[PDB]
Scaffold this active site. Structure first.
Site, short mmCIF file in Angstrom:
data_model
loop_
_atom_site.label_atom_id
_atom_site.label_comp_id
_atom_site.label_asym_id
_atom_site.label_seq_id
_atom_site.Cartn_x
_atom_site.Cartn_y
_atom_site.Cartn_z
CG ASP A 131 5.79 14.49 -0.08
OD1 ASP A 131 6.35 15.26 -0.89
OD2 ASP A 131 6.24 13.35 0.19
NE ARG A 135 7.99 12.92 -4.38
CZ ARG A 135 8.22 14.22 -4.50
NH1 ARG A 135 8.43 14.77 -5.69
NH2 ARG A 135 8.25 14.98 -3.42
CG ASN A 136 3.58 11.28 -2.93
OD1 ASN A 136 3.99 10.13 -3.09
ND2 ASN A 136 4.10 12.12 -2.05
CG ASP A 149 3.52 8.91 0.27
OD1 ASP A 149 3.40 7.99 1.11
OD2 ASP A 149 4.56 9.11 -0.39
C1 LIG Z 1 1.88 -0.68 -10.10
O1 LIG Z 1 2.89 -0.22 -9.22
C2 LIG Z 1 2.52 0.43 -8.05
C3 LIG Z 1 1.29 0.23 -7.42
C4 LIG Z 1 0.93 0.92 -6.19
N1 LIG Z 1 -0.33 0.69 -5.60
C5 LIG Z 1 -0.62 1.34 -4.47
N2 LIG Z 1 0.21 2.24 -3.82
C6 LIG Z 1 1.44 2.47 -4.31
C7 LIG Z 1 1.86 1.82 -5.59
C8 LIG Z 1 3.11 1.99 -6.26
C9 LIG Z 1 3.46 1.34 -7.44
O2 LIG Z 1 4.69 1.54 -8.04
C10 LIG Z 1 4.90 2.63 -8.91
C11 LIG Z 1 6.10 3.50 -8.44
O3 LIG Z 1 6.23 3.54 -7.03
C12 LIG Z 1 5.58 4.65 -6.44
C13 LIG Z 1 6.57 5.49 -5.50
O4 LIG Z 1 5.90 6.64 -5.02
C14 LIG Z 1 4.52 6.46 -4.81
C15 LIG Z 1 4.27 5.83 -3.37
O5 LIG Z 1 2.99 6.16 -2.79
C16 LIG Z 1 2.47 5.25 -1.86
C17 LIG Z 1 2.33 5.66 -0.54
C18 LIG Z 1 1.83 4.78 0.42
F1 LIG Z 1 1.70 5.22 1.70
C19 LIG Z 1 1.47 3.48 0.10
CL1 LIG Z 1 0.85 2.41 1.34
C20 LIG Z 1 1.60 3.05 -1.23
C21 LIG Z 1 2.14 3.88 -2.25
N3 LIG Z 1 2.22 3.44 -3.62
#
Ligand SMILES: COc1cc2ncnc3c2cc1OCCOCCOCCOc1cc(F)c(Cl)cc1N3
Length: 287
Positions: A131, A135-136, A149
């Site tokens: 993936d 975005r990731n 992710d």
């Molecule tokens: C300052 O804002 C953020 C801080 C973050 N810190 C740490 N991790 C984040 C964060 C996401 C944030 O929001 C921005 C937009 O959202 C992002 C949507 O797609 C990305 C998701 O990827 C992930 C996958 C996972 F398994 C886990 Cl546990 C955590 C995350 N994401």
């Protein structure tokens, strides 16, 4: 294992919602260690067989690379909440959209180097990401991005998958190289949507007939050819990640010849005083 901490419901709280995917919802949270008064910020992903989950989870918490995010903790009960370190800048896709004119060619090319470095680590560990997308990719500091992710894919994006993944659900380290190309394309377009206006049901149709993502306006032909070889139909003809690390590292040593951006000679560059300041506050890992 000593790497995946199992958490109780009572030792963390969801505070603010950050986003969602078609997999789960990401929250900004607080960890309150038992017996302590401090509250530590964490990121929490609440997903939309328990042993299978924990097993894939251990595999996740076993990633030791400066450009790959590690799963830190889990809470298996009502719902599967996953805990990792909070990245206050967010995901790399949103970052290039909000800053779509003040990102120089030094930053973009160094981001490409680091994502390839993290992907190459996943291949060495024989782990397929499945993936990869802008975005990731999370931003720890503007000078340091990390891929996230990882495992959520199996634990639970047509326009990012290779043709063989679309047609036959074949995911290999070379189909990740296709995904890398689309991620690179997204950064060079400052967050444009790939195949914008095209329905996802028709992508495999246009892919078989020879169409590819067009050339971004800031890309020289040298950069666009790398992205095009990532989208060759023969998966074994696509570049290896170790070859991509070498190629983007070269172009990062002369950014102006491979990317044409307006004012690249007026954009901010990573300063030593600035890079040291960022490290002491937000980014103390080895590098
Ligand atoms: C300052 O804002 C953020 C801080 C973050 N810190 C740490 N991790 C984040 C964060 C996401 C944030 O929001 C921005 C937009 O959202 C992002 C949507 O797609 C990305 C998701 O990827 C992930 C996958 C996972 F398994 C886990 Cl546990 C955590 C995350 N994401």
């Amino acid at each position: 294992q000593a790497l995946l901490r199992i958490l109780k419901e009572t030792e963390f709280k969801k505070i603010k919602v950050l986003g969602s995917g078609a997999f789960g919802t990401v929250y900004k949270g607080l960890w309150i260690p038992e017996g302590e008064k401090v509250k530590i910020p964490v990121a929490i992903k609440e997903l939309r067989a328990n042993k299978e989950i924990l097993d894939e989870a251990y595999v996740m918490a076993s990633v030791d690379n400066p450009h790959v995010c590690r799963l830190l903790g889990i809470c298996l009960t009502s719902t599967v909440q996953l805990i990792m370190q909070l990245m206050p800048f967010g995901c790399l896709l949103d970052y290039v959209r909000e800053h779509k004119d003040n990102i120089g060619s030094q930053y973009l090319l160094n981001w490409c180097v680091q994502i390839a470095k993290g992907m190459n680590y996943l291949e060495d560990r024989r782990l397929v990401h499945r993936d990869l997308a802008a975005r990731n990719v999370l931003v720890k500091t503007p000078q340091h991005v990390k891929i996230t992710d990882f495992g959520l894919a199996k634990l639970l994006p047509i326009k990012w998958m290779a043709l063989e993944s679309i047609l036959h659900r074949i995911y290999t380290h070379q189909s990740d190289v296709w995904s890398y190309g689309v991620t690179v394309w997204e950064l060079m377009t400052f967050g444009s949507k790939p195949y914008d206006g095209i329905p996802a049901s028709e992508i495999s149709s246009i892919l078989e007939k020879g169409e590819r993502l067009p050339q971004p306006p800031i890309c020289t032909i040298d950069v666009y050819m790398i992205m095009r070889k990532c989208w060759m139909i023969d998966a074994d003809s696509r570049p290896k990640f170790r070859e991509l690390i070498i190629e983007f590292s070269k172009m990062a040593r002369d950014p102006q010849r491979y990317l044409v951006i307006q004012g690249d000679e007026r954009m901010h560059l990573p300063s030593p005083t600035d890079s040291n300041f960022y490290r002491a506050l937000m980014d103390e890992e080895d590098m």
